[PDB]
Amino acid sequence: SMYVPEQYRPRDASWTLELIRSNPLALLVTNGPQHPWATHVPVLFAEDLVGRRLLGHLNLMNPHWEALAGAGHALLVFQGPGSYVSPTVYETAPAAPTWDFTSVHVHGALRLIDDPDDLRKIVQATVRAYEREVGTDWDMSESLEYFERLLPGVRGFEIKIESVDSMFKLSQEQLPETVTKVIDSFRRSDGGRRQELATMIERAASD
Amino acid sequence: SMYVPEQYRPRDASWTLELIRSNPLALLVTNGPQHPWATHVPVLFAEDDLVGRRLLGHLNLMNPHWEALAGAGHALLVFQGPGSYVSPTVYETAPAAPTWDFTSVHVHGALRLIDDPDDLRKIVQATVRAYEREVGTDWDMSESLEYFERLLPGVRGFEIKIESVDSMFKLSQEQLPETVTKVIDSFRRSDRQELATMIERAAS
Amino acid sequence: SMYVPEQYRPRDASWTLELIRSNPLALLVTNGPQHPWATHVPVLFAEDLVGRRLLGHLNLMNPHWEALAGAGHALLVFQGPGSYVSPTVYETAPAAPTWDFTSVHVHGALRLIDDPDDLRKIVQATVRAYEREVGTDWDMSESLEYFERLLPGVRGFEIKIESVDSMFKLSQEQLPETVTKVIDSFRRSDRRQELATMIERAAS
Amino acid sequence: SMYVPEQYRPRDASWTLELIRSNPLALLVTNGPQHPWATHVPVLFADLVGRRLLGHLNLMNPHWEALAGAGHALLVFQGPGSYVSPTVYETAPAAPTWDFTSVHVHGALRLIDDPDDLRKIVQATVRAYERETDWDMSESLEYFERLLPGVRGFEIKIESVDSMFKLSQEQLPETVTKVIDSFRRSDGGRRQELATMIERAAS
Ligand code: HEM
Ligand code: HEM
Ligand code: HEM
Ligand code: HEM
Ligand SMILES: [Cu+2]
Ligand SMILES: [Cu+2]
Ligand SMILES: [Cu+2]
Ligand SMILES: [Cu+2]
Ligand SMILES: [Cu+2]
Ligand SMILES: [Cu+2]
Ligand SMILES: [Cu+2]
Ligand SMILES: [Cu+2]
Ligand SMILES: [Cu+2]
Ligand SMILES: [Cu+2]
Ligand SMILES: [Cu+2]
Ligand SMILES: [Cu+2]
Ligand SMILES: [Cu+2]
Ligand SMILES: [Cu+2]
Ligand SMILES: [Cu+2]
Numbered sequence: 001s002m003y004v005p006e007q008y009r010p011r012d013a014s015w016t017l018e019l020i021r022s023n024p025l026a027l028l029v030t031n032g033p034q035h036p037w038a039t040h041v042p043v044l045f046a047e048d049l050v051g052r053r054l055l056g057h058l059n060l061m062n063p064h065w066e067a068l069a070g071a072g073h074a075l076l077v078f079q080g081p082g083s084y085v086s087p088t089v090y091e092t093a094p095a096a097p098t099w100d101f102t103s104v105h106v107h108g109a110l111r112l113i114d115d116p117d118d119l120r121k122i123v124q125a126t127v128r129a130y131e132r133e134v135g136t137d138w139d140m141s142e143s144l145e146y147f148e149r150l151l152p153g154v155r156g157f158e159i160k161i162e163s164v165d166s167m168f169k170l171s172q173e174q175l176p177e178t179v180t181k182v183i184d185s186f187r188r189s190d191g192g193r194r195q196e197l198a199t200m201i202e203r204a205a206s207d
Numbered sequence: 208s209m210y211v212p213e214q215y216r217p218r219d220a221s222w223t224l225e226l227i228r229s230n231p232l233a234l235l236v237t238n239g240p241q242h243p244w245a246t247h248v249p250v251l252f253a254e255d256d257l258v259g260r261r262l263l264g265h266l267n268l269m270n271p272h273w274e275a276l277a278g279a280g281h282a283l284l285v286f287q288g289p290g291s292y293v294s295p296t297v298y299e300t301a302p303a304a305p306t307w308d309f310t311s312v313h314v315h316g317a318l319r320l321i322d323d324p325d326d327l328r329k330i331v332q333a334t335v336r337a338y339e340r341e342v343g344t345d346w347d348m349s350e351s352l353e354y355f356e357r358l359l360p361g362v363r364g365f366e367i368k369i370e371s372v373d374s375m376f377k378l379s380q381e382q383l384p385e386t387v388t389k390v391i392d393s394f395r396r397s398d399r400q401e402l403a404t405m406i407e408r409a410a411s
Numbered sequence: 412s413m414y415v416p417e418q419y420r421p422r423d424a425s426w427t428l429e430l431i432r433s434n435p436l437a438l439l440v441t442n443g444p445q446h447p448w449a450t451h452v453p454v455l456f457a458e459d460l461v462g463r464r465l466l467g468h469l470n471l472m473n474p475h476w477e478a479l480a481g482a483g484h485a486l487l488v489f490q491g492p493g494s495y496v497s498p499t500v501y502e503t504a505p506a507a508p509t510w511d512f513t514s515v516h517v518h519g520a521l522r523l524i525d526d527p528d529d530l531r532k533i534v535q536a537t538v539r540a541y542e543r544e545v546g547t548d549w550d551m552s553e554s555l556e557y558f559e560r561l562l563p564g565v566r567g568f569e570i571k572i573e574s575v576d577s578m579f580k581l582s583q584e585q586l587p588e589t590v591t592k593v594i595d596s597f598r599r600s601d602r603r604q605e606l607a608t609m610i611e612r613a614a615s
Numbered sequence: 616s617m618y619v620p621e622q623y624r625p626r627d628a629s630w631t632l633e634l635i636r637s638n639p640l641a642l643l644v645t646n647g648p649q650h651p652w653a654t655h656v657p658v659l660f661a662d663l664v665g666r667r668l669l670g671h672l673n674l675m676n677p678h679w680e681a682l683a684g685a686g687h688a689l690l691v692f693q694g695p696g697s698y699v700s701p702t703v704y705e706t707a708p709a710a711p712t713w714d715f716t717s718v719h720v721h722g723a724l725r726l727i728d729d730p731d732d733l734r735k736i737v738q739a740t741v742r743a744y745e746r747e748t749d750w751d752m753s754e755s756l757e758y759f760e761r762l763l764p765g766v767r768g769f770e771i772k773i774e775s776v777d778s779m780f781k782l783s784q785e786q787l788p789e790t791v792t793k794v795i796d797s798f799r800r801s802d803g804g805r806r807q808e809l810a811t812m813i814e815r816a817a818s
Contacts, residue, residue, distance in 0.1 A: 002245060003246065003269075003270040025292075025307050029236055029242070030242065031238045031242060032444075033443075033478065034280065034281040035236070035281045035315060036237065040311060042307060061210075063210060066616060066721075066775065072241065075243055083342075084343060087348075088343075088344040093350045094350055094353065094354035095351055096351060099232045099247075101247065135305070136296040142302055146302035146304065167247070192289065192400065192401060208474065208477060370480075412677075413653060413654065413655075414673065414676040414678065436696065438691065440651050441650065442649075442651055445646075446646060446687040447646055449691055451617075473618040484649045484650040485650055486651055490693065497745065497750050499750045504754045507755060507758065508741055508744060508745070510640050510657060512655065518650060542700065545700075546698060546700040546702075547700040549700050553708060554707065554709055556708065601807075602804035
C-alpha cells in the first residue's frame, strides 16, 4: 500500500473523490512475471469509498487484458497536480528540496467484463461522466452507431474497492508563512499544473 | 510491458529522455502479495539507447516498500508527462469518440539496493543538482549540506539497470492533420500548453 | 517429454538430424502464466544431439522475448511430413483411421543473446544454412549492409540440448503389404510424397 | 499469445476455420516442470470464442495425467509453409524469410474419462476426418470398443485465437505475383496449396 506520512493525509474525503473524478485516467497495476503489468485506463464510479465499484475499459488486443484473468486483485493509481519545490521559494536555510504532489491508490478485488451489453453501458457512461466532468457537454447520440462498430474491440473490468491510500503532499510540513511563499511562487508560474497545485496547497492550509 | 500502438510511438528518442528528465518523480512498481507495491520516488540518470543506463532513486527507510524491495529482482518505473481529456467537440467532426491524450514512459529494469551512507549522500546531492538545473532555480545547497547529514540516516536508495523502455506519446496522431490542428488550437486557447506543444511536435 | 511408442522410434539418428535441418522453422515453447508461450522461430545448429546447441532468433518486439528472461529451459518442436491415413487404403476390416507424422521435440537449457556481433553471426549463418539446404544458393553479400539496418530489431537465443524425443509414426503397426499400399497411395497424390519416402525408409 | 504483425492477420475468419479443419492434428501444449508438455492430438469442433474443441490421446501418455493440474491450455494448428529465398523476389537488397500459416487457440481445459463420451468423440473424429475417403466405420465399431478403454479425452473451451497468415504481404504486389508463380511451378509439398493461399491474401 502507499505509505502516507500522517501530515499528508487528506483532511476531507472530498479531496480523494475529487482527485479521482478530476483525473480518471488511472494506472492499472497487477502482478506479473518478474515485474508488474501497468496500463493507463479510463475509469469511472458505478454508483468511505470502500465497497464502491470502479469500472474501466481497455484494448482487447492489449496483452494486459489476457493477464487480468490470473489476477484476483489490483491497484489503480490516480495522480493530480504535482511539482518540484525549490528551496529558493522557502527563502530559508538550511533546507532541502522536495516534490509536492497528489495521488490516490485504490486497492480492490478485480472482476472481468466481456459481455457486450455491459461494455456498451460502460463506454457510454464514461463519455457522459467525462463530458460533464472534464469535458464540453458533447452529445454522443449521432455517434452511438459508431460505438457499436468499435464495441467488439473493447474489453472491461470492475474493481470493488477494498482500501484507499491518499497522498496530499502539499507543503504542510512547512510553517504557514513559508507555505504562503510556496503558493505564491506556484501562482507566479504559468507552467501546468502549478496553478491547480497552488490552489490545493491553499485549500489544505485553510479552515 | 506497456502496449503502445505504432502511431503513438515517439518519432525521436529525445522525446523519451526529455519526458524522463522533466518529470523525474516516477512511480516505482514491484510485485507484491495479491497486488503490486507502488511508491512515488525521485529518480535521476546516473550519467532504447537508454537500455543499459542506470536510474538512481531514494525513498523513506520507514516505507514498507523499502523492506519489500529486498527479494525483488526487477522493477518498473513509470514516468508521466502532460495529458488531457479530448472531447469530440474539438474535432468538429461526426461521428466520433472522445479520448485521452497523454504521455508516459515505462522503464523495465534490474533492481539493486543501496544502503551505504556514502552512496546515499552522492545520490541525494546529485538529485538536488539535477533537479535544480532541470526543474529548479539553481539553488545552492552548500549551506544545507550539514542538514543533509542529519537527514541521511533516514533515507535508502535503489538503482535500476534499464533493460527495456516503452514510450507512449498519445498525441492525436490517429486524427486528420486538420483535426489535429484544431486539437492543438483548442489546447492553446484553453486554461494544456505543454501538451499542445507536444502534439504540434508529433504533427510536424 | 513427448510420449513415443517404441514402434514409432527412429531406426537411425540421421532421420532426426535430417528432420531438424529440413524443417528448421521450429516452435519455441516455454512456460507462461496459465498456459505456455509459443513462437515460430528459425533455428539452426551451432558449428547424440545431447550437448549440442541450437541457435535462433526472433522479434525484439515479440513479448515472448521478454518472457524468455526468467525461463531456464525450453522445448523446440520440429514437424516434418504428416498425413491422415484413411482405412480405405488398408483394404482391411476392422480398422481405425490414424495419422502418420514426423516430429522432433528438443529439450534444452535456454540462454539469451542480445550482443549485436553474435546476432549478426546468427542471422548470416541462418541465411547460409537455409540457402544451402532449402534455398537456391542466393548470395547475400550485396545485402549485408541491409542486414545491419535490420539488426537492432532482432534478438537471439541458444538452447543447449539436454534431451530429444523423436516421433516417426509411419504405419509400422501395419503388415508390410499394407504399408506398401499406404506408400503407393501417398505416392499417387500430390506432403504425401516426402512422407511416402519416409515410410518406405522405415520399412526398408 | 502468438505475436502476429498486423500485415499477417487473416482478412477473413474463414481462413482460420479452414486451416483448423484442414490440419486437425494439433499440438496440445500445457505448462510443466522446467518446460512445457507438448503432445500431437487429433481434435475437432463440437468468432471461435466460446466454441469447444474436443480431442483424445493415449491413457498411458503421461501428458494425460499432467492435464489434471492444468486449468488452461494452448492448441497449435499448422497449415502449409515454406522457405522464401530472395532469388524469387528478383530484388536487391533483400532478406530471406519463411512463409507459414498457424493458428494458436487458447482455452480452458476440461477432462473426459466417461466411456460414452469417449465413444462419441472417437466416432465423431472418424466421421469428420473422413468427410474433410468417406470410409465407413460400421464394420469396425466392435473393434473400437476393444480400443476404447485405452483412450482418454479433453475439451478446450476457446477463449482466444491468434492467427498467423504470413503470406508475403510485406512484399510489393508485383513481387507477391512472383512468389505465387514460383511456388506454383514447384511440385514440392505444400508450395502449391501455399501459393494459392498467398494469392487469396493478395486478392
Ligand atoms: C464511448 C465509446 C467508446 C468506445 C466504443 C471505446 C472503445 C475503445 C476501443 C475499441 C479501444 C481499443 C483501442 C482503440 O480503439 O483505441 C479503446 C481503448 C482505449 N480507450 Fe476507449 N472507447 C470509448 C470511449 C472512451 C473515452 C471517453 C475515453 C476517455 C479518455 C477512452 C479512452 C481509451 C483509452 C485510454 C484506451 C487504451 C486502452 C489500452 O491501452 O489498452 N475511451 N476504447
Ligand atoms: C530534489 C531533491 C529531492 C526530492 C525531489 C525528494 C523527494 C522525496 C520524496 C518524494 C520522498 C518520499 C519517499 C517515500 O515515500 O518513501 C523523500 C524521502 C526522504 N528523503 Fe528526499 N527528496 C530530495 C532530496 C533529499 C535530500 C538532499 C535528502 C538528504 C538526506 C533527502 C532525504 C530524505 C529522507 C530522510 C526521506 C524520508 C523521510 C522524509 O520523507 O522526510 N531527500 N524524498
Ligand atoms: C533464412 C532466413 C530467415 C528466416 C527464415 C527468418 C525468419 C524470421 C521469423 C520467422 C521471424 C519472426 C520471429 C517472431 O515472431 O518473433 C523473424 C523476425 C525477424 N528477423 Fe529473421 N529470418 C531470416 C533472416 C534474417 C536476417 C538475415 C536478418 C538480419 C538482421 C533478420 C532479422 C529479423 C528481424 C529484425 C525480425 C523482427 C521482425 C521482422 O522484421 O520480421 N532475419 N525472422
Ligand atoms: C476410430 C475410433 C478411435 C479409437 C477407438 C481410437 C483409440 C485410440 C487409442 C486406444 C489410443 C491409444 C494409443 C494407440 O492405440 O494408438 C489412441 C491414440 C491416438 N489416436 Fe486415436 N482412436 C480412434 C480414432 C482416431 C483418429 C480418426 C485419429 C486421426 C488421426 C486418431 C489419432 C490418434 C493419435 C495421434 C493418438 C496418439 C495420442 C497420444 O500421443 O497420446 N485416432 N487412440
Ligand atoms: Cu499494501
Ligand atoms: Cu510483464
Ligand atoms: Cu523483464
Ligand atoms: Cu491492497
Ligand atoms: Cu511485459
Ligand atoms: Cu502490497
Ligand atoms: Cu488486498
Ligand atoms: Cu520488463
Ligand atoms: Cu488465459
Ligand atoms: Cu502467455
Ligand atoms: Cu525436458
Ligand atoms: Cu498470451
Ligand atoms: Cu515436462
Ligand atoms: Cu528438462
Ligand atoms: Cu491465453
